[PDB]
Each structure stands twice: as C-alpha cells, then as structure tokens.
C-alpha cells in the first residue's frame, strides 16, 4: 500500500489484471488476534 | 520508518552503524493493544 497509491476503479484502465495487495497492517493486526485468542481458553478454564 | 527505506541487510552496507530506528506505528498500536488486553482481561474475570 505504501508503493501504490488508489484512483479510479477497475472498470476504467484497459488491459488492468487481479491480484493481492499487501496491507503491512493487516498481519500485524491479525498477529494480535492470534495472540488475544488464547484469551479463548481463559475464559473456559 | 516513514522516512525511510529497508533495502539490503546491515552486512552489504560499508561504513553502516548501528542505531534505533523509531516507528511511529509502535506506540500507537501498543496502547490500544493494551486496550485490548485489558478488555479481554474482563472477558476472563
């Protein structure tokens, strides 16, 4: 996200193909999730 | 780390020193995770 930037919509460019943008955030906010789900298992014990 | 760049490791580098590059994503993220601690802390108690 850091090396592109947003404009326009994929109905405009010709010749525009798919495929997956990194988002730096989002595995350090799911790195979090992970850890504040083994708060799971503290609240059944 | 905004006004910066990481290419390459410390080793390729002559003359490179060594020093704390700050992130200003670090402490922001570390108080709501405390934030987030602390909530699942009551989800336990």
């Given at each position: 996200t850091?090396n592109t ?10 010749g525009?193909?798919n495929?997956?943008?990194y ?14 789900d ?8």
């Amino acid at each position: 996200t850091d090396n592109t930037f947003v404009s326009g919509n994929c109905d405009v460019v010709i010749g525009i193909v798919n495929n997956t943008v990194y988002d730096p955030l989002q595995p350090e906010l799911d790195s979090f999730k992970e850890e504040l789900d083994k708060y799971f298992k503290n609240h059944t014990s």
